[PDB]
């Protein structure tokens, strides 16, 4: 049992440089008069799910949300158990 | 004694009455059935000796060169049976009889309860050796080799004889229980300190030292495969017996006069085993690692302690089934190549991977690797030097990693790697080589559950 | 056990604490350790009992070899060969037997050293000053002689230590 | 089933020669098994004799 | 008698049987990684009970 | 590694689709056997940086001799088809 | 011993709720255990014992006579 | 002579991983930094918590190299961290283990890191040492940070560098369960441990509130 | 060897020799398992220098720091029977000499 | 830490050298000079056998600290007082070695500043 | 890898090589596509200029003057693809490339197993023996006299030839064989 | 500019960077080609024997048999004693004897004089 589905590839007009750093890059080259020959190719690198980022902060709370509503709940049982 | 030297005079009636086509089952066969019966001496005492007669005693620094040499006969005859195919049966049988009569000299060398007898069969056993280097030899340069192995030989020993004689005049017995029990102090006088060189430099000759190892290569290169077994093996141990034998009656002068084979050996492990990097051929390196073992055991007999003496024995015996191992393991790559240097035939792990863990373990017991008896007698060897002097240890570390450099290198050149292109005939490993390995490495790892057995009598 | 006797190789009572629970959570411990009992120790202990019944409907013994004393190598002449062969087999027999004397004293000091744990330094200054005067004794016979040790060599050692240890009294008996 | 035979071949077999190879060969011979001596603390008693040991000094309790 | 030593020889006794099995039919199939893990765990399991003990 | 076995149709999908985002050269006008230096117009800078978009999207470099040899993408594909041993 | 993925050639590849929902757990569990933690034992980090001041102590508790006795 | 060695070590391997692209690289730095760490704590006569270090150590960087080899046969042998990008989303349990495991080597307080680590920041601070080994420590435990967020950084917040061919997957049962293992061991082992042996060593109970919170700041 | 081309195809692609040509004579040193002359960004002056000079300043920054070392505003430890006399050492038939700790 | 910049770059005689502390007598500050208290003897803690190290004066609180460990197993969390007693008794006993090192600093500095007025009224 | 290689390297080879290699390190250098991207545009850019140079004195002036300056900046640890001369696996199956004659020395029962492809190769056998016999008066003959100048290979040029030396390059085993 | 490269023994110069490749001159190409020429033929032998159905032998190769021989055989026919070799052999050959000879005797008689005066504390020592 092995990938053996056919896998197609998209539609090469979907790639547009537009939206991404690479339109800074354009027109920063532009503005020197030069233009990238490759700058379509490297599109699919912002394009999908790879377009939203995280910062370094945010990757280190990953879980902090979750953990915080149960240290909340656990912390106000026991002090609703112990007060007895 | 003569349960063990009958059988073995018999294995030439037998060999010479055979069948032209099985001679080589017979020998085998019977050879191994004499190392059975060899086997009854390793039972020793704490006390003197096993004396059976007035010609012939036992010991058990005698008992386990007697079965190593009782048990190299077989794996002589079953790696020799191969590259003496297309040859006549009368010098196939002249073979085994050259084999057979060089274990009779040895067998009675060991024991000798006498010294001129002892140095009768010890000069008897160069006769064979020589014939088969000359005779049965590939290269051109085997007469040589065998006149280099000769005449070192004879140059290091006519002095001993003569000392011999002496010594006897003087005290009136050469005897190795006499010479024991009335041993006397030697005065630090010129005459005796020429003695003591004519005593010595024969058995040094033969380990070889450092100074006097050239023959060694020689013929280590261009003997056949049987002969390269025995002279690594057995033959190399001669020279550590008879110092071990000797050396009682040399004292106190020994402790001055060895300061320069001390210094020879101490610095000629680490030249051959730093020579062992740049080497171009498998047997010449087998060879150099052999001289560095046994300037080691050079050095060990020449402290003169008995963790010294224990750890010469046990290393003796361990680099004799060692040496013997990567020999054949060289000439079944030969038998093969038909070139004998390292870097034509390589990546042979993967067309041969059972051939390649015999080479792993072989490399591994050569490199001293614990709870193996090599390491065994590296480490007392070592502890008795460092108790004799604090800063051989220095040397000695040194000698261990060159030691295991040279060890994988010989590994990895020849079993790692890429498989040459063009070689075509690498057939796949026989049962009879095999079996050879096995029956050469399973021993050490049996004794090494027994070490006592092959510490010698100061254990 | 009867195998060994307890005077050669001493051992303290042994006394151990009792097990005082305070709390009512049962302890993993002892569960663990009757359910290895009953596992493991009664199967082996039947066994053993099935082999000693075996071995007793078998019974022989062996006896430890005695040896005679005799003249040791001062009441030998010079060259008499037999009064010799006899002098250095006894003495190698009492170099043995010392040896084994060593090894006994050495093997109390690791017991003692490992059983009273952390207190070792205190608790273990006796055999630490048995094993001290018994490798004085051994070195003193043995330790200079080397390889093809023999009777005369440690005799002449002798002589000369002691030699010296009358120079040394006469010497102070006359400062 | 799987788990079932492997715990006896390779752990219950093992430990069965283990055991009676210790408390029957190696045991016998005098220093070879050596325990701690476990600690001893005050108020303890011991099963072998039944005394009990003194309590301390009472030193000044608080914080 | 005091489990002590028999647990503590025996993990390290149990970590051996594979390499004894190697040249049993086992190795030459796909379920002996499976069986050299599966000792490993039981190894470590059974080695807890000396931790305990000293605990 | 659990990597599909690609064949000679992904190999050269993958091709057209990378010289296809190379903007260029327009999409319509290229094919199989269209030549880099006269058919496209393209510098031979441009054909090693077409080499260069090739190592980066089939995850190995080609080396300078072979790769300043190639000027169509079907020698490109069966290039990379032997040093891949592609069956079909 | 898994399910069938399949390659996505420059999209984004597919996810399985279960290894999100696993490791969103654990990174909450870890955080929780690490402010459970945080209130039941804060003096680990904080300290529980002041930090005396050498200069506050008088010289009658520290055997100072006024330079003149001794 | 062993504190000296040891915070020599810890420094040139820690500065030394600081700056490579190979991820194997960083970390085996990171573990000789790590045993340079050990023997900085054999030399100022601290035998069981360098032990007590070797045992969380274990836990908490095998684990690392557990998310490391993921990475790498997720994106077909790759190595250089200059051709990753993306992970936090494209690869979740990975991620989440390894940043579980960079904040244990760095020492997060009640993680499994913090038990040994500060520890060996209170004991080496408060003990007749050498000035300059106190110091290399100090800088050592800071490129211990570096390194830490270098690899994170590099492998798992910014864009996609990857060939276009995705072959990201992690849906097997014995990766998942052979990470997790080591993951509630580098969550809890610390805490269990620490709290179930016994004490073996004179704690540093009182201290300077600055130079109790040397090792967070510095990190 | 190492630095030799590795895309040219070889006779033997290991060693990276071909079959007739003339092997040097320290082949045998340059394997690619050993010693290599493969030059590097930076000069071998330069490495030895700077290698040479961060080895040398670790050694003489150590040596400072045993002449100036670090500790705490507190006094020697103290221990309460003769300095634990009787289980540091024992001797206890010698009496030594008492020592009574100050209280502050 | 602030004592080693006030020693290595001020003046060396000003502040003490810790191994040879203590320089002075001491009884030298006031006659009375309590002894310091024993609560263990020498038979029961050397049948705790801490360690050498662990051999000080907050000897009783660790050997009961010992007890709760050994007696309360699987809840090893049970005894955090006397956890807490052991520390507060280390605590005291750093505090009191702190309090030695300024006595001697401050016995130190006195006495400097004795001879700097012993030679002052020489010199006058 | 596979073709023959030049007496020499020209200009044009050369300029090409260095712009590769100086390409491929400002990837090294800048991490990021988009920073990659610019950096590559302005050192393409800047390369251009000097194109329509004619001077071939000043055209030896410059790229060996860039040599040195791509050699200062040469990131001392580049990127190298995994099977590259300096990839980390770069000879990673080369234990598992067994040669093809070995399947000559199996035992008759371990032939007994996959009979259709020892068939097969007793095929490819025949067509060799016949196509060597072939090919060595093809090489005699179509080689120059004196020797070879360049190490390549004429193509089969009758209806039933095959390629000159083609036995081990088409049986090559092949680069993952396990 | 830029600062210079220094080549050494282990670390030589750079292809790329040899002042002797951009002097290009006739005579330079007809070398490169005649190398290429003898190169080739000498992979056309290497071939020709190669891909023999025939053969079925390790191919001999004169050059490793040169190589080999050069090395070990043919070294004392060509030797000449000469004041290079002589003090090299000499130093090489003596000196370290004489370093370690006098090493260990020093050593050796403190270590008997400290025995001789008895302030060398060898208690415990009974193995040697
Ligand atoms: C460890 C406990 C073991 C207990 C079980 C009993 C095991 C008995 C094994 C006896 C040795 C094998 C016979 C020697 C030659 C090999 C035979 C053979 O043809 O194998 C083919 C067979 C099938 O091969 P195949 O798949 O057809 O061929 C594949 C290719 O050839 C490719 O082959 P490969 O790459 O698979 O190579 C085989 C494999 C293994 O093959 C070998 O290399 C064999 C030699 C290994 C040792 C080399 C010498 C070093 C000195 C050690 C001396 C120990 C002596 C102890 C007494 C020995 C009594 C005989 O390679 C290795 O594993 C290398 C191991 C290196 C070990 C390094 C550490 C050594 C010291 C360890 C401690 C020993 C004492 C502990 C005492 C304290 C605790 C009790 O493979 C094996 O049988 C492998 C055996 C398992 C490995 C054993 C390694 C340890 C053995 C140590 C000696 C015995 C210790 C007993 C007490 C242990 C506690
Ligand atoms: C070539 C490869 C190695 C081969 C084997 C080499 C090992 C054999 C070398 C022999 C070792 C030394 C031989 C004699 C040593 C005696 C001790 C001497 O060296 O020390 C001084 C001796 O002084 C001088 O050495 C005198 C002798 C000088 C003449 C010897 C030649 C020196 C170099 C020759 C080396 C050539 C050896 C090989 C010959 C073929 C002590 O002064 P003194 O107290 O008065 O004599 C004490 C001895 N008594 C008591 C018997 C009188
Ligand atoms: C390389 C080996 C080491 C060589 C070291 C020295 C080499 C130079 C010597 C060359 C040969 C010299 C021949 C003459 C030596 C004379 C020695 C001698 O006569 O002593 C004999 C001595 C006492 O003589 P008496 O007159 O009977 O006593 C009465 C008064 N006390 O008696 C004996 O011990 C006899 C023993 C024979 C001595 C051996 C002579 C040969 C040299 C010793 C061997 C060393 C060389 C070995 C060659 C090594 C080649 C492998
Ligand atoms: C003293 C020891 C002297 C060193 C012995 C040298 C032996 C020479 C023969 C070795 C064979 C040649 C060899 O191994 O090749 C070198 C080989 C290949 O180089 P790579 O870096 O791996 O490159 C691979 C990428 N292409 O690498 C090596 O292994 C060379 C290792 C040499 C180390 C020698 C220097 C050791 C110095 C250590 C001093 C410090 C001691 C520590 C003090 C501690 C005190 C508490
Ligand atoms: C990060 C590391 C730093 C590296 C530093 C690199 C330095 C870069 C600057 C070098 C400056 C130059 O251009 S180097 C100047 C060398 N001389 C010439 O370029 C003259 C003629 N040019 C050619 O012939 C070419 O091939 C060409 C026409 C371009 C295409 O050819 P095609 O039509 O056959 O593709």
């Known amino acids: 049992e092995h990938g053996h589905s056919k896998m197609e590839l998209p539609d090469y007009k979907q790639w547009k440089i537009e939206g991404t750093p690479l339109e800074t890059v354009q027109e920063k080259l532009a503005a020197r008069g030069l233009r990238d020959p490759w700058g379509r190719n490297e599109a699919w690198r912002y394009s999908g799910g790879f377009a939203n980022n995280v910062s370094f902060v945010g990757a280190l709370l990953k879980g902090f949300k979750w953990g915080f509503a149960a240290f909340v709940v656990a912390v106000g049982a026991e002090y609703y158990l112990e007060s007895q | 004694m003569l349960k063990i030297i009958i059988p073995t005079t018999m294995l030439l009636p037998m060999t010479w009455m055979s069948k032209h086509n099985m001679i080589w089952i017979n020998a085998t066969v019977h050879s191994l059935l004499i190392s059975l019966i060899s086997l009854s001496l390793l039972n020793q005492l704490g006390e003197n000796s096993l004396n059976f007669s007035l010609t012939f005693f036992s010991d058990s620094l005698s008992a386990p060169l007697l079965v190593l040499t009782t048990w190299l006969l077989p794996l002589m005859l079953m790696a020799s049976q191969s590259h003496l195919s297309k040859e006549t049966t009368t010098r196939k049988k002249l073979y085994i009889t050259m084999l057979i009569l060089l274990q009779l000299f040895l067998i009675m060398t060991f024991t000798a309860t006498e010294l001129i007898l002892f140095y009768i069969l010890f000069e008897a056993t160069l006769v064979p050796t020589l014939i088969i280097i000359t005779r049965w030899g590939n290269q051109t340069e085997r007469l040589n080799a065998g006149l280099y192995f000769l005449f070192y030989t004879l140059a290091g020993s006519l002095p001993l004889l003569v000392a011999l004689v002496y010594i006897q005049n003087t005290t009136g017995s050469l005897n190795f229980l006499i010479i024991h029990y009335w041993s006397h102090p030697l005065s630090n006088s010129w005459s005796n300190i020429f003695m003591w060189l004519a005593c010595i430099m024969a058995f040094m000759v033969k380990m070889p030292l450092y100074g006097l190892h050239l023959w060694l290569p020689k013929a280590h290169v261009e003997a056949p495969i049987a002969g390269s077994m025995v002279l690594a093996a057995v033959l190399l141990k001669l020279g550590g017996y008879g110092m071990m034998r000797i050396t009682t009656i040399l004292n106190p002068l020994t402790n001055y006069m060895a300061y320069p084979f001390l210094m020879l050996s101490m610095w000629g492990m680490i030249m051959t085993s730093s020579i062992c990097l740049r080497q171009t051929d498998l047997k010449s390196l087998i060879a150099y690692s052999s001289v560095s073992h046994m300037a080691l055991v050079i050095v060990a007999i020449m402290i003169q302690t008995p963790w010294s003496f224990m750890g010469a024995t046990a290393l003796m015996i361990a680099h004799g089934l060692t040496s013997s191992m990567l020999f054949c393991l060289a000439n079944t790559n030969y038998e093969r190549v038909h070139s004998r240097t390292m870097i034509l035939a390589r990546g042979l792990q993967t067309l041969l991977p059972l051939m390649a863990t015999w080479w792993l373990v072989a490399s591994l017991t050569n490199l001293a690797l614990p709870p193996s008896i090599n390491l065994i007698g590296e480490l007392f060897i070592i502890t008795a030097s460092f108790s004799w002097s604090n800063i051989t240890i220095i040397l000695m570390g040194m000698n261990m990693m060159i030691t295991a450099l040279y060890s994988l290198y010989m590994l990895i050149t020849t079993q790692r790697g890429k498989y040459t292109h063009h070689i075509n005939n690498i057939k796949p490993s026989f049962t009879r080589e095999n079996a050879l390995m096995a029956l050469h490495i399973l021993p050490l790892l049996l004794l090494t559950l027994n070490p006592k057995m092959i510490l010698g009598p100061l254990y | ?99 084994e004397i060593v090894n006994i004293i050495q093997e109390r000091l690791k017991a003692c050293q490992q059983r009273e744990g952390e207190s070792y330094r205190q608790n273990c200054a006796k055999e630490l000053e048995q094993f001290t005067q018994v490798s004085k004794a051994f070195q003193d016979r043995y330790s200079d002689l080397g390889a093809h040790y023999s009777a005369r060599k440690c005799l002449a050692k002798q002589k000369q230590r002691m030699l010296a240890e009358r120079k040394a009294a006469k010497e102070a008996a006359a400062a | 089933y799987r788990h079932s035979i492997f715990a006896v071949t390779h752990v219950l077999i093992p430990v069965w020669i283990i055991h009676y190879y210790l408390k029957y060969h190696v045991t016998a011979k005098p220093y070879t098994v050596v325990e701690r001596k476990p600690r001893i603390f005050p108020g303890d008693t011991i099963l072998e004799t039944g005394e009990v040991i003194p309590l301390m000094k009472e030193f000044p309790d608080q914080h | 008698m005091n489990p002590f030593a028999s647990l503590t020889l025996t993990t390290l006794t149990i970590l051996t049987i594979p390499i004894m099995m190697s040249n049993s039919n086992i190795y030459k199939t796909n379920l002996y990684p499976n069986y050299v893990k599966t000792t490993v765990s039981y190894a470590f399991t059974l080695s807890l009970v000396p931790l305990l003990m000293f605990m | 590694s659990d990597a599909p076995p690609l064949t000679l149709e992904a190999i050269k999908d993958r091709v057209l689709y990378v010289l296809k985002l190379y903007d260029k050269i327009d999409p319509e006008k290229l094919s199989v056997n269209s030549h880099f230096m006269k058919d496209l117009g393209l510098d031979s800078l441009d054909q090693v940086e077409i080499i260069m978009a090739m190592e980066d999207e089939f995850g190995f470099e080609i080396p300078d001799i072979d790769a300043e040899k190639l000027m169509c993408p079907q020698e490109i594909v069966d290039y990379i088809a032997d040093k891949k041993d592609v069956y079909e | 011993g898994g399910v069938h993925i399949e390659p996505r050639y420059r999209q984004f590849p597919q996810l399985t709720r279960s290894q999100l929902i696993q490791a969103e757990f654990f990174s909450a569990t870890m955080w929780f255990w690490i402010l459970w933690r945080f209130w039941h034992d804060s003096d680990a980090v904080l300290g529980h014992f002041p930090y005396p001041d050498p200069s506050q102590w008088t010289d009658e508790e520290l055997g100072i006579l006024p330079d003149d006795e001794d | 002579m062993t504190l000296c060695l040891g915070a020599i070590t810890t420094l040139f391997t820690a500065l030394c991983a600081i700056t490579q692209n190979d991820i194997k690289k960083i970390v085996a730095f990171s573990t000789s930094s790590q045993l340079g760490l050990m023997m900085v704590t054999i030399g100022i006569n601290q035998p069981h918590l360098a032990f007590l270090h070797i045992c969380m150590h274990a836990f908490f960087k095998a684990m690392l190299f557990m998310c490391s080899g993921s990475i790498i046969h997720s994106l077909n042998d790759e190595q250089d961290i200059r051709k990753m990008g993306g992970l936090y989303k494209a690869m979740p349990f990975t991620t989440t283990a390894l940043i579980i495991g960079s904040l244990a080597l760095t020492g997060m307080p009640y993680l499994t890191g913090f038990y040994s680590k500060d520890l060996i920041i209170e004991a080496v601070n408060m003990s007749y040492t050498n000035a300059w080994a106190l110091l290399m420590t100090l800088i050592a435990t800071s490129l211990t940070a570096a390194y830490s967020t270098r690899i994170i950084f590099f492998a798992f917040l910014g864009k996609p ?37 016994p004490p073996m060593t004179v704690p540093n109970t009182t201290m300077p509130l600055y130079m109790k919170m040397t090792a967070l700041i510095v990190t | 060897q190492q630095e030799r081309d590795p895309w040219y195809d ?14 040097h004579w320290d082949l045998d040193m340059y394997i690619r398992n050993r010693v290599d002359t493969s030059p590097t960004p930076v000069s071998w002056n330069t490495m030895c220098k700077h290698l040479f000079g961060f080895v040398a300043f670790m050694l003489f920054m150590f040596w400072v720091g045993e002449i100036y070392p670090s500790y705490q505003p507190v006094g020697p430890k103290q221990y309460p029977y003769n300095d634990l006399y009787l289980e540091r050492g024992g001797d206890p038939t010698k009496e030594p000499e008492p020592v009574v700790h100050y209280e502050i | 830490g602030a004592h080693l910049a006030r020693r290595y770059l001020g003046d060396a005689s000003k502040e003490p050298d810790p191994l040879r502390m203590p320089t002075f007598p001491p009884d030298y500050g006031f006659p009375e000079r309590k002894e310091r208290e024993m609560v263990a003897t020498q038979q029961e803690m050397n049948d705790a056998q801490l360690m050498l190290q662990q051999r000080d004066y907050c000897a009783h609180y660790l050997i009961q600290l010992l007890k709760c460990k050994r007696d309360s197993f699987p809840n090893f969390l049970a005894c955090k007082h006397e956890q807490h007693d052991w520390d507060y008794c280390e605590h005291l006993d750093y505090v009191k070695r702190m309090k030695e090192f300024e006595r001697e600093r401050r016995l130190l500095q006195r006495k400097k500043r004795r001879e700097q007025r012993e030679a002052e009224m020489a010199r006058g | 890898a596979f073709s023959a290689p030049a007496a020499y390297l020209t200009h044009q080879q050369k300029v090409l090589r260095l712009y590769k290699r100086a390409l491929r390190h400002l990837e090294s250098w800048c991490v990021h596509r988009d920073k990659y991207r610019y950096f590559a545009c302005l050192m393409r850019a800047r390369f251009d200029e000097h194109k329509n140079e004619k001077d071939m004195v000043k055209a030896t002036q410059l790229l060996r003057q860039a040599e040195e300056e791509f050699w200062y900046g040469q990131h001392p640890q580049p990127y190298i693809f995994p099977e590259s001369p300096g990839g980390t696996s770069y000879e990673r199956y080369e234990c ?82 396990m | 500019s830029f600062p210079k490269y220094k080549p050494s023994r282990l670390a030589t110069l750079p292809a790329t960077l040899d002042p002797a490749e951009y002097d290009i001159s006739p005579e330079t190409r007809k070398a490169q080609a005649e190398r290429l020429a003898i190169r080739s033929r000498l992979k056309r032998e290497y071939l020709l024997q190669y891909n023999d159905p025939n053969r079925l032998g390790v191919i001999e190769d004169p050059a490793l048999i040169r190589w080999t021989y050069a090395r070990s055989a043919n070294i004392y026919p060509n030797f000449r004693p000469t004041p290079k070799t002589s003090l090299l052999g000499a130093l090489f050959g003596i000196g370290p004897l004489f370093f370690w000879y006098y090493v260990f005797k020093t050593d050796r008689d403190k270590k008997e004089k400290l025995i001789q005066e008895g302030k060398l504390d060898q208690t415990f020592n009974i193995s040697y």
């Open chain 3, 1 to 99: 056990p009867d195998s060994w006797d307890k005077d050669v190789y001493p051992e303290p009572p042994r006394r151990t604490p009792a097990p005082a629970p305070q709390t009512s959570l049962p302890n993993p411990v002892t569960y663990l350790t009757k359910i290895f009992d009953l596992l493991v120790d009664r199967p082996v202990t039947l066994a053993r009992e099935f082999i000693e019944q075996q071995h007793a409907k078998n019974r022989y013994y062996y006896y430890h070899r005695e040896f005679r004393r005799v003249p040791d190598i001062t009441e030998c002449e010079e060259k008499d060969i037999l009064c010799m062969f006899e002098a250095e087999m006894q003495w190698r027999r009492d170099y043995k037997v010392d040896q």
């Open chain 8, 161 to 197: 560098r990857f060939p276009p061919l995705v072959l990201i997957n992690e849906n097997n049962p014995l990766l998942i369960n052979s990470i997790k293992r080591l993951l509630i061991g580098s969550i809890f082992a610390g805490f269990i441990i620490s709290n179930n042996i």
């Open chain 9, 10 to 23: 070889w006779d033997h692609p290991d060693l990276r020799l071909n079959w007739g040509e003339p092997i």
């Open chain 11, 96 to 177: 598992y490339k067994v040669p093809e004659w070995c399947l000559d020395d199996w035992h008759p029962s371990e032939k007994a197993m996959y009979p259709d492809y020892f068939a097969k190769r007793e095929q490819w056998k025949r067509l060799r023996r016949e196509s060597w016999e072939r090919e060595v008066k093809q090489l005699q003959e179509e080689t120059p006299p004196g020797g070879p100048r360049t190490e390549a290979l004429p193509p089969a040029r009758k209806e039933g030839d095959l390629p000159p030396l083609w036995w081990h390059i088409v049986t090559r085993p092949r680069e993952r064989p």
